[PDB]
Amino acid sequence: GPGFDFAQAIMKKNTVVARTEKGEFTMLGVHDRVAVIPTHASVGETIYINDVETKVLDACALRDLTDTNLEITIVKLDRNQKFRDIRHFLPRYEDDYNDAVLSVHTSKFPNMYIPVGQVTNYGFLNLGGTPTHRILMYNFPTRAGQCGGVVTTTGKVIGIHVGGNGAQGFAAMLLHSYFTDQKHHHH
Ligand SMILES: *[C@@H](CC(=O)OCC)[C@H](C[C@@H]1CCNC1=O)NC(=O)[C@@H](CC(=O)[C@@H](NC(=O)c1cc(C)on1)C(C)C)Cc1ccc(F)cc1
């Protein structure tokens, strides 16, 4: 069936509740003190992590070479815990997937799992009026409150939930090359 065991292990060790002025989001920690959150969360220079106020040391809203929103923001956080390194679970390329799980960790839903079915490489999405690329699509009625939710299949962390129209759900891709270790003035 769906990979519930895999999704649970990712939730246990690699998720936190993140809270900005836009609300609460599931936040996936990727490695060391680096995590991801939907760009719509509007991260500033501090963020609440599990209700603890935390300095945001770096924040990078990803865009592609067309200067189009990818809806992923990568954050570096000032906190003592290191995240388990899950980069080796990230896909190398764009792909479609079978029988994925969407996993939420918020104050309202401290852990909840939703089998979303098949996931297709959707591409372009007008996301609440912002053009966005690299989007994954599932036919599941996802809802407000699930943004940031982790999308997995066994062995792979493939996206974070960012949108939905009452019939389909949409995730922003996570690619392995987003998190590899030059000299760049990026602000
Ligand atoms: C998650 C965030 C949340 O709860 O509110 C953030 C303040 C939310 C999940 C969806 C809400 C309804 N169902 C969901 O799964 N994400 C959003 O609200 C983004 C906006 C949307 O999802 C819109 N949907 C679409 O634009 C759309 C287009 C198509 C083909 O299908 N759906 C609304 C109709 C909900 C938030 C967002 C992200 C990026 C932006 F630039 C603007 C807004």
Author numbering: 1 to 181, 183 to 188
Please give sentences taken from the publication describing this entry.
From these data, the shared scaffold of rupintrivir/AG7404 appears to be well accommodated within the active site of EV68-3C protease. At P2, AG7404 lacked the fluorinated phenylalanine ring of rupintrivir and was unable to pi-stack on the catalytic His40. As AG7404 is an analog of rupintrivir, this compound shares many structural similarities and protrudes in the same regions, highlighted at the S4 pocket, where the isoxazole ring forms the same hydrogen bond contact with Asn165. At the S4 pocket, the mutation of Asn165 into a larger residue could preclude binding of the inhibitors, while other mutations could remove the potential for hydrogen bond formation, potentially decreasing inhibitor binding. Furthermore, this additional hydrogen bond formation, not conserved in viral substrate interactions, has been implicated in resistance against rupintrivir in HRV-3C protease. While there are no sequences of circulating strains with mutations at these residues, mutations can emergence under repeat exposure to inhibitors. This concern is exemplified by previous studies that demonstrated a 7-fold (V104I) and 15-fold (N165T, A103V, and E3G) decrease in potency when mutations arise in HRV-3C protease against rupintrivir.
The Picornaviridae family of single-stranded, positive-sense, non-enveloped RNA viruses includes several pathogens of concern such as enterovirus-D68 (EV68).
